[PDB]
Design an enzyme around this catalytic site. Structure first.
Site, short mmCIF file in Angstrom:
data_model
loop_
_atom_site.label_atom_id
_atom_site.label_comp_id
_atom_site.label_asym_id
_atom_site.label_seq_id
_atom_site.Cartn_x
_atom_site.Cartn_y
_atom_site.Cartn_z
CB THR A 121 1.28 3.47 -5.57
OG1 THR A 121 0.99 2.60 -4.47
CG2 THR A 121 2.77 3.48 -5.82
CG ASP A 132 -2.13 0.88 1.05
OD1 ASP A 132 -2.98 0.57 0.18
OD2 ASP A 132 -2.25 1.87 1.79
#
Ligand code: ADP
Ligand code: ADP
Ligand code: ADP
Ligand code: MG
Ligand code: MG
Ligand code: MG
Ligand code: MG
Lengths: 75, 105, 130, 535, 526, 98, 94, 364
Positions: H37, H3
């Site tokens: 991201t 994550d």
């Protein structure tokens, strides 16, 4: 205000200090005066021993710091 | 005579007159404050009527001391012990002067 | 500084329940009524918590960092004094405001209630603010 | 000469007289006097640049970094971190002048420094310091008598405050509030006159509350013939303004009563619980109804109160304020003409105060609300509320207003005034010079030195104003000698004249006399010290 | 002989003093450094700053506000402290002008340094500056325009003032939307100055344009367990009672019996007392109940069985805002239901904002309390948006209080400088030089405004001076392209109070600092 | 000073009358004890412990000289010198003990 | 500021103490070798500083191998050496 | 972790730009829950381009305005290239969940987690009316042991608290009762003491306390309750030993120390209205359930599961199991990401292609 790098003594203080030095030098050898006087036995901190009554020898062997006392020693 | 510095006046002190022309001075060693009757004192009640009676009794004790002081005819009150704000205001209402915590000397 | 061990090492004496979550600490002090806990941190805020429900009732910020907290026992809501700043401050939690202040570490509330000690590193009468 | 005497005996044995004598110092004789005179001269020369209308402020920083910008000599010396004992003596002299008078705390230091500077060259010529002190005392007596001679009286009546306003303006001229000069003088005069015992008695400064708040402008400073409070109405929904308010002052919290003695109330049955609940509710209702019975429109308490009392007060159209401090409670009671009631049962109508307007004041985008009580009938207490652009000018205005209040108090005590601007010092110097001529020769030098030291104030005023000191002072002295006029001083403001009567530069006679007396006594005390024994 | 420059030592260890030239040097250096630091964040093309805390928190905060920049900096120069306190007081008095007052004071002190270098007594400079300040204040007052009578003109002036206030901030990207937002929020106050009646809620995520003003009110509390989650035509009762183990205010009271049956009876009596309290509350005929303090489980389930919402722990600000928005009365006793007013609103419901649930008060009765939701990409963005919105709200509230307005874009500064120059041209002596320096600083302020935009500041300021001397009293800087234009037509207006405060505070602090000729520091504790 | 219990002292007040009368009764008892001591002709009182304020006031009222001796050796020596006996209670002294 | 008449390390002693100390030092020096006199004397082992061993009962050798600090003891050692050099016998006796 | 928000939060970045990137990741997680991201990568690339833009001699304000224009155009393009979706189309939801779970460590288990995530999201909302999803309605329970293949979707309520009773661990046709008061000796809010002056008062007090506890337990039992949940209590013993003995003797499962924050979740799950006084404890205020039993996780702890309820109101629980703690943490983070993606689909009914297609189309 003077800004002199040292110590200054003025007035009765320095006179009393000089008299103290002279009196101390006198008292060093005052006990070796006259026929009822007695000798002193000096040690030169290396084991050397000197037994004497002569004032000049005693005052030369001793190391003195105050200059008014040096005056009496050289006297 | 005698003169000493003012000693930590409480609220209501500035309403007291600051000059008298024939005052009678009451010298006391008394704490004129609302406080516990004694250090080891303890009150045990089991009715609200007794609760109100106890509160009014404390107030009446303080006011009885103050009235006894006032009826003596004195106008200046000096005490060695602290004098509370309640007593200060009581004396101010009577045009009287109070000063607590006056030193021994 | 005084932190009691974790497991309580006892046999269910109905006192092993302690909360003591410590979500805020330098002046943790239990109140008169045990239902409230008062704690302070180095952020200059005084935090009041209800021990039963377990959430911050209301935080107090009027100071730098606060160090010493003392409480005058009356419902635990009447007053509590903080002396963390050189500013002795008294707060009322029925309004959440600094009722009075004294600009002058070990503050102690006098048992009488009319004054309080302000030991630092004086008997300040609350009836005269001096 | 220093550290004492170190001999270690004439027999070599140790000679210890005083504990830690090797770590102690000692100054003996004339050099101690020279050092003390030098320290006092340094302090006086530092102070002298802050003298007169053209004086410049010193910007003090304490140990915590807090910054104070001020012209008050007493404040500057109090905040100055000194170590020399004579400097501490000068600070104490300034504090003494501030305590006795409240003005002229900078002139005393300059005068003492000048006196010691002259005493230095007198000592260098072989005069015993006791003789110098005696001559200084004689010349000080002569100067005091001359001031009493050339003093002038002013009217202190409330129907004509012009001389009082002029005197306050003269006091405030040197401070930063000279922008609002006349307004500041007016408010100071009115504040002193409103609260003062008319029979030439004392003025109690406890009844003049000075409060300063940031924001606004310096011109917004005003005199309130009432009390300003740093509180507000307890319930947010009560009205913010009350007119013709009947005020009830109370020192009992609006809570159920409790004995002071350690007490326990026992609940032994459900009936006891119901009785306790009903008693609490009826106590709240009874206290609220008792307050309402007197007809009061407003209630002021000192010890706060809880939610039920708050809602009952709101519900009965009774605006209230809580946690009002003791001094503020006293001030409100004095101003509104009402008594202080310790409990509700004793509250009657005759104990109610009166105020024409009670209002809540906002201060911009600051969330802060401050209560105002004013429009009283015959209020004996007043409040000075100061506004400014930053805290520092607020503090400076506070101390300047204190100086003005102290000066008007001095006028209350004694109504004799002497015109300033250096005229008084020049006339005293002339009188001392004339008296020294008849004096025998030996004290002539001390009296002439005293006159020269007195003449430093006009020289300092000329220096601060850019004029040539010696030329201006000599010209003014020659004019004073030629025409009989002791009111000729230094034209610091370049108004085009040297007569201080037209310029209305007025100083209290008590202030000048206190300055001269204190300076002479401190100079004598410093001159009498001949040894120092610091560790 | 100086206090420090004497053979005799008169100070403690660490204490020192700085004489005339040294004190002036340090004061001018500190003031000019503060002015240069706070500037370059001025005008529409100003830039932001990064404030990295060196403490344990290491808090990061980007900002454009001068007061916030000057607050969170370690300042050791005393004159810098003076200017910082000036900026803080300016922020307290009015919402805007924090950067302008500091820049003006710094420029004035720089001119004072030049004048001192020209061998001019500081008292002469102070007198000239006082006269110049009086003339400039009179000119600014004479130039003020009031539109408080016409409602449409006043609304347009509010639009323009909010836009001008938000022009320099990060909200300039959505200036139009945020200006409408702030104007509506301020106008909803119905003339009250209570800025705390407007609540700003910062929720992370979403775009900045997603920010909006709720048509009602938003609360960030929770509803009870069994109570309804949606009410229509709500009848609000706002209270400030205990409602949590409510103990009688008698404090020596205690339960002292000889059996546990009596203890159980007393416990049942306490529960019955709480039930009677809840019944008294419910007898008002209410649908919702907001209490400032907590509500424990027993009253909570009583309300749930009554079908009444019980919002708990709404702090003093919360209950005050609810009373303002719904018209209810914050009560603490319930023995007189007829004497207590009840708040009302069309609908109460729960809404999702990001990942959190909030209570929505729709169709409010009064509405004199606003909730503004802020959505941003970063926490720093949210904080800067909140600060900018606070500035706009404060300026709008001040304009509502006093409707006198003056033109911005340097028009007021150039007009005041022209008046000061006119006064100086008729004044003999070095006071004229001091007045000219004052006017030079006044003109330097819009010069810095033009510098921040990368424009030809010298040419623009020369054109502005020529236009103002000719008679064009409304000419100002047009930052859209970089020319001069009519500020009245282009609608760059701003509060007369703000400019008057900036001028007076800057002149006052410059005078205070200039009077200093000696700085003496006690020995620090460290 | 007025004698107190050696175990523990606790003033139990259950009515307002007791609260209003306790201090007055204690002061009256102190006055009665001091006057009983004075009625024997004893114009000088020497004690080895502290002196209460009320007791001192009532002694001053009856013109009684008070001397306090901390050291019990001094108390015994004074008893020898004068011929008195150190009473353990605050009862008035009999003819032989004075 | 150590102002002094004589040097810091200078030590002075005088009076009855000096005479008593000298006489006691001479007495103890005598007591060292008191038992090494006569036809029934005993040997003494002397550990030379250079690692050697001197085993003898001659007074001069025993006294010479001993190092002392008191000047009176040094005088007694010199007396023993003089007696040994002059006649070669009677060191312990002297 | 994979994550982006977790990676940026865990490592303490010091430069202010990195801190604002972390805040940007947090905001993207809050608003969407996926693409954390990608947003950081986009911001980094944008500033990298800004480097050369500034070097060429372009003012930053011009760059910001042009970037705003580009953002508006790109939003228009992305909206143009998307297609509408319906929450009734299960295949689209499954594909979105699988796409969310491809990049995480739980990819071989995606065939198990994606339908599980879709079912979890659908069971807590109304597809025809809901415009947002409250993920607090999906409780995630992490238990060490087993394998991620053992992850379970529990329709009812899962409690980690252990049963105080011994010998009673399975109750069928349960009637769960939620209790917010204490089953111990009476204790008023006021300070209270019992004063004993006679020897008979001692055992009278003992007998009266026993009778009080027995009456409390009998009143609880009379309603038909057989499973009792006791809220955690402080300053007073929630469950006395004598009370526990009486409850055991009448065959009632007792679970104590229930957290205060879980009361709302429990009431939403099993439909039990909390009880704060014994006077209001009635049968109609209980919550019926099909089964309430305590199971053991193959010597890795015990879980109490109440599966099957008469009123299953918009609530579901997710049990996550794994070999070690790190993989369990990553698995629950990935499950949360999938739930957030389905939440995004619920909020905005629009679908776009993946695999870099939107970015290439945007660039062109
Ligand atoms: N307008 C004026 N013209 C000439 N001299 C003045 C004027 N105002 C004040 N002075 C003089 O300035 C001196 C200093 O006064 P000030 O600085 O106000 O207080 P301090 O005496 O404490 O320094 C006074 O002695 C006074 O005579
Ligand atoms: N759109 C604009 N055009 C020209 N000048 C402006 C504009 N907006 C603001 N200004 C000017 O910028 C100056 C500074 O305003 P700003 O930076 O917003 O707040 P602060 O006064 O706190 O610096 C103001 O004096 C104003 O005249
Ligand atoms: N099977 C796949 N084939 C091609 N591209 C994929 C596949 N799965 C995911 N992606 C792409 O990888 C990118 C990163 O997704 P992911 O790492 O799951 O979350 P984040 O977007 O937060 O990094 C997404 O933009 C997606 O388009
Ligand atoms: Mg003065
Ligand atoms: Mg602005
Ligand atoms: Mg032989
Ligand atoms: Mg993803």
């Amino acid at each position: 205000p003077l800004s002199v790098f040292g110590d200054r003594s003025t007035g009765e203080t320095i006179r009393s200090q000089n008299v103290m030095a002279a009196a101390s030098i006198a008292n060093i050898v005052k006990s070796s005066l006259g026929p009822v006087g007695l000798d002193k036995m000096l040690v030169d901190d290396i084991g050397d021993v000197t037994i004497t009554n002569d004032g000049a020898t005693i005052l030369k062997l001793l190391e003195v710091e105050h200059p008014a006392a040096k005056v009496l020693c050289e006297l | 005579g005698v003169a000493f510095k003012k000693t930590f006046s409480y609220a209501g002190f500035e309403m007291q007159p600051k000059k008298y022309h024939n005052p009678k001075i009451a010298l006391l060693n008394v704490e004129l404050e609302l406080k516990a009757e004694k250090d080891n004192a303890e009150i045990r009640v089991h009715t609200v009527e007794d609760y109100q009676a106890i509160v009014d009794a404390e107030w009446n004790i303080l006011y009885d001391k103050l009235e006894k002081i006032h009826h003596s005819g004195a106008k200046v009150v000096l005490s060695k012990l602290p004098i509370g704000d309640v007593a200060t205001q009581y004396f101010a209402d009577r045009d009287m002067f109070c000063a607590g915590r006056v030193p021994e000397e | 500084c005084s932190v009691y061990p974790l497991t309580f090492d006892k046999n269910e004496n109905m006192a092993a329940k302690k909360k003591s979550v410590a979500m805020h600490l330098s002046a943790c002090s239990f109140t008169n009524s045990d239902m409230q806990i008062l704690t302070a941190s180095g952020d200059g805020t005084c935090a009041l918590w209800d021990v039963e429900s377990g959430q911050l009732l209301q935080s107090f910020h009027g100071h730098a960092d606060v160090l010493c907290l003392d409480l005058a026992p009356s419902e635990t809501g009447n007053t509590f004094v903080s002396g963390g700043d050189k500013k002795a401050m008294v707060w009322d939690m029925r309004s959440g405001q600094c009722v009075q202040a004294f600009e002058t570490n070990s503050v102690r509330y006098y048992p009488s209630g009319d004054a309080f000690a302000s030991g630092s590193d004086r008997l300040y009468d609350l009836r005269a603010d001096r | 000469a220093s550290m004492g005497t170190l001999a270690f005996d004439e027999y070599g044995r140790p000679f210890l007289i005083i504990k830690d004598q090797d770590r102690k110092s000692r100054l003996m004789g004339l050099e101690a006097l020279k050092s003390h005179i030098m320290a006092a001269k340094a302090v006086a020369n530092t102070m002298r640049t802050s003298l007169g209308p053209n004086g410049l402020d010193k910007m003090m920083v304490d140990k915590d970094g807090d910054v104070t910008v001020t012209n008050d000599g007493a404040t500057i010396l109090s905040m100055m971190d000194v170590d020399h004992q004579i400097a501490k003596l000068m600070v104490e002299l300034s504090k003494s002048q501030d305590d006795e008078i409240g003005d002229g705390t900078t002139g005393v230091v300059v005068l003492a420094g000048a006196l010691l500077e002259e005493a230095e060259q007198l000592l260098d010529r072989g005069i015993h310091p006791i003789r110098i002190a005696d001559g200084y005392e004689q010349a000080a007596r002569v100067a005091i008598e001359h001031l009493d001679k050339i003093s002038d009286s002013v009217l202190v009546d409330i129907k004509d405050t012009e001389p009082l306003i002029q005197t306050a303006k003269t006091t405030l001229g040197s401070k930063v509030v000279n922008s609002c000069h006349r307004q500041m003088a007016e408010i100071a005069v009115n504040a002193v006159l409103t609260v003062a015992d008319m029979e030439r008695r004392d003025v109690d400064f406890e009844l003049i509350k000075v409060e300063g708040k940031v924001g606004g402008r310096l011109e917004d400073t005003k005199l309130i013939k009432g009390v300003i409070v740093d509180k507000d109405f307890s319930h947010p929904q009560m009205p913010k303004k009350v007119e013709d308010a009947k005020i009830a002052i109370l020192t009992c919290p609006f809570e159920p009563p409790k004995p002071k003695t350690k007490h326990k109330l026992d609940v032994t049955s459900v009936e006891d619980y119901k009785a306790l609940q009903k008693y609490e509710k009826e106590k709240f209702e009874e206290m609220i109804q008792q307050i309402k019975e007197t007809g009061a429109n407003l209630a002021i308490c000192q010890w706060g109160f809880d939610d039920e009392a708050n809602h009952l007060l709101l519900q009965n159209n009774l605006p209230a304020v809580r946690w009002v401090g003791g001094p503020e409670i006293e001030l409100i009671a004095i101003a509104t003409g009402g008594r202080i009631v310790p409990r509700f049962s004793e509250l009657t109508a005759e104990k109610l105060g009166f105020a024409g307007l009670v209002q809540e004041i906002s201060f911009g985008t600051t969330k802060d609300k401050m209560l105002v009580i004013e429009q009283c009938k015959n209020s004996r207490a007043v409040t000075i509320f100061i506004r400014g652009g930053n805290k520092m000018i607020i503090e400076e205005a506070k101390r300047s207003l204190h100086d003005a209040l102290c000066v008007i108090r001095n006028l209350i005590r004694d109504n004799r005034v002497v015109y300033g601007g250096g005229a008084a010092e020049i006339s005293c110097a002339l009188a001392v010079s004339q008296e020294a001529d008849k004096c025998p020769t030996l004290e002539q030098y001390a009296m002439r030195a005293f006159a020269d030291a007195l003449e430093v104030i006009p020289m300092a005023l000329s220096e601060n104003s850019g004029m040539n000191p010696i030329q201006t002072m000599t010209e003014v002295r020659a004019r004073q000698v030629k025409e009989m006029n002791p009111a000729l001083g230094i034209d610091c403001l370049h108004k085009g004249t040297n007569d201080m009567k037209q310029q209305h530069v007025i100083e209290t006679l008590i202030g000048k006399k206190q300055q001269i007396s204190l300076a002479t006594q401190m100079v004598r005390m410093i001159l009498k010290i001949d040894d120092i024994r610091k560790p | 002989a100086s206090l420090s420059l004497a053979p005799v030592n008169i100070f403690k260890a660490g204490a020192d003093e700085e004489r005339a030239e040294t004190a002036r040097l340090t004061s001018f250096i500190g003031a000019i450094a503060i002015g240069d630091l706070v500037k370059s964040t001025l005008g529409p093309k100003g830039m932001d700053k990064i404030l990295l805390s060196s403490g344990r928190d290491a808090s990061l905060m980007v900002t454009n506000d001068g007061a916030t920049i000057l607050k969170n900096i370690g300042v050791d120069n005393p004159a810098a402290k003076v200017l910082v306190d000036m900026s803080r007081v300016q922020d307290d008095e009015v919402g805007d002008g924090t950067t302008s007052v500091t820049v003006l004071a710094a420029e004035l002190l720089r001119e004072a340094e030049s004048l001192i270098a020209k061998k001019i007594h500081p008292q002469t400079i102070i007198a000239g500056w006082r006269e110049a300040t009086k003339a400039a204040r009179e000119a600014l007052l004479s130039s003020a325009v009031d539109h408080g009578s016409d409602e449409v003109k006043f609304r347009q002036d509010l639009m323009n003032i909010a836009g001008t206030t938000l022009s320099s901030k990060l909200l300039t990207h959505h200036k139009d939307h945020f200006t409408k937002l702030a104007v509506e929020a301020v106008l909803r106050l119905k003339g009250s100055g209570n800025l705390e009646a407007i609540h700003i809620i910062k929720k992370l995520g979403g775009s900045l344009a997603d920010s909006y003003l709720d048509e009602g009110f938003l609360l960030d509390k929770k509803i009870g367990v069994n109570q309804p989650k949606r009410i229509e035509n709500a009848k609000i009762l706002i209270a400030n009672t205990g409602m949590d183990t409510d103990k009688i205010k008698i404090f020596g009271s205690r339960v002292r019996v000889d059996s546990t049956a009596k203890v159980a009876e007393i416990e049942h009596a306490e529960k019955e007392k709480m039930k009677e309290k809840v019944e008294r509350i419910l007898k008002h005929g209410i649908n919702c109940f907001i209490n400032r303090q907590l509500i424990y489980n027993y009253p909570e389930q009583l309300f749930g069985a009554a079908g009444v919402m019980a919002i708990e722990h709404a702090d003093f600000a919360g209950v005050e805002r609810l009373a303002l928005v719904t018209g209810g009365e914050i009560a603490s006793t319930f023995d007189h239901p007829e004497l207590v007013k009840l708040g009302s609103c069309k609908l109460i419901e729960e809404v999702m904002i990001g990942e959190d649930k909030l209570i929505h008060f729709s169709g409010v009765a009064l509405g004199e309390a606003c909730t503004i939701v802020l959505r941003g990409a970063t926490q720093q963005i949210l904080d800067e948006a909140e600060r900018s919105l606070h500035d706009a709200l404060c300026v709008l509230a001040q304009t509502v209080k006093d409707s006198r307005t003056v033109y911005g874009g340097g028009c007021s500064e150039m007009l005041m400088a022209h008046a000061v120059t006119q006064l100086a041209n008729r004044t003999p002596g070095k006071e004229a030089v001091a007045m000219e320096s004052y006017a030079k600083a006044l003109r330097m302020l819009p010069t810095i405004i033009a510098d921040n935009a990368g424009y030809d500041s010298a040419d623009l300021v020369a054109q502005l001076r020529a236009a103002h001397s000719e008679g064009n009293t409304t000419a100002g800087l047009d930052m859209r392209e970089g020319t001069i234009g009519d500020m009245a037509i282009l609608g760059i207006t701003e509060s007369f109070q703000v400019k008057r405060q900036v001028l007076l505070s800057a002149a006052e602090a410059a005078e205070v600092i200039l009077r200093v000729d000696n700085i003496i520091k006690a020995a620090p504790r460290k | 000073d007025g004698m107190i219990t050696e175990t523990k002292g606790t003033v139990l007040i259950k009515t307002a009358e007791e609260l209003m009368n306790f201090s007055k009764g204690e002061e009256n008892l102190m006055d009665a004890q001091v006057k009983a001591i004075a009625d024997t002709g004893a114009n000088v009182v020497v004690t080895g412990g502290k002196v209460a304020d009320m007791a001192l006031h009532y002694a001053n009222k009856y013109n009684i000289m008070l001397v306090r001796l901390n050291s019990k050796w001094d108390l015994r020596r004074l008893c020898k010198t004068v011929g008195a006996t150190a009473l353990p209670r605050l009862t008035p002294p009999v003819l032989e003990e004075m | 500021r150590p102002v002094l008449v004589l040097s810091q390390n200078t030590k002075r002693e005088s009076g009855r103490k000096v005479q008593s100390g000298n006489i006691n030092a001479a007495k103890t020096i005598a007591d060292i070798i008191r038992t090494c006199l006569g036809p029934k004397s005993m040997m003494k082992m002397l550990l030379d500083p250079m690692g050697g061993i001197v085993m003898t009962n001659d007074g001069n050798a025993i006294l010479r191998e001993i190092q002392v600090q008191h000047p009176a003891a040094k005088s007694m050692i010199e007396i023993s050496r003089t007696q040994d050099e002059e006649v070669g016998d009677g060191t312990t006796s002297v | 972790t994979n994550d982006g928000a977790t990676i940026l939060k865990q490592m303490q970045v010091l430069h202010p730009a990195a801190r604002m990137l972390v805040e940007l990741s947090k905001a993207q997680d809050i608003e969407a829950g996926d693409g954390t991201t990608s947003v950081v990568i986009i911001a980094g690339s944008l500033l990298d381009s800004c480097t050369k833009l500034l070097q060429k001699g372009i003012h930053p304000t011009i760059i910001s305005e042009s970037f705003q224009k580009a953002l508006e155009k790109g939003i228009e393009i992305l909206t143009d290239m998307s297609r509408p979706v319906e929450l009734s189309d299960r295949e689209t939801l499954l594909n979105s969940a699988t796409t969310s779970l491809n990049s995480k460590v739980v990819s071989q288990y995606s065939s198990l987690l994606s339908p599980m995530s879709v079912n979890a999201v659908m069971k807590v909302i109304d597809p025809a009316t809901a415009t947002s999803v409250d993920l607090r309605d999906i409780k995630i329970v992490k238990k060490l042991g087993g394998t991620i293949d053992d992850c379970e979707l529990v329709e009812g309520l899962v409690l980690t608290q252990k049963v105080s009773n011994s010998g009673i661990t399975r109750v069928e046709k349960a009637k769960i009762g939620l209790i917010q008061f204490c089953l111990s000796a009476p204790k008023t809010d006021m300070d209270n003491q019992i004063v004993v002056s006679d020897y008979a008062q001692m055992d009278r007090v003992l007998r009266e306390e026993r009778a009080y506890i027995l009456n409390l337990v009998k009143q609880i039992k009379k309603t038909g309750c057989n499973v009792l949940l006791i809220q955690k209590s402080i300053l007073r013993d929630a469950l006395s030993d004598l009370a526990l003995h009486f409850l055991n003797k009448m065959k009632i499962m007792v679970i104590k120390d229930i957290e205060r924050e879980d009361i709302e979740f429990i009431c939403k799950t099993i439909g039990t209205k909390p009880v704060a006084h014994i006077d209001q404890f009635t049968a109609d205020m209980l919550g019926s359930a099909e089964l309430a039993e305590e199971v053991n996780l193959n010597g890795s702890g015990k879980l109490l599961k109440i599966t099957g309820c008469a009123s299953p109101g918009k609530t579901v629980t997710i049990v996550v199991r794994g070999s070690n703690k790190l993989v369990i943490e990553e698995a629950e983070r990935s499950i949360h990401d999938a739930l957030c993606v389905i939440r995004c689909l619920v909020k905005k009914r629009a679908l776009i292609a993946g695999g870099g297609a939107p970015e290439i189309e945007l660039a062109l």
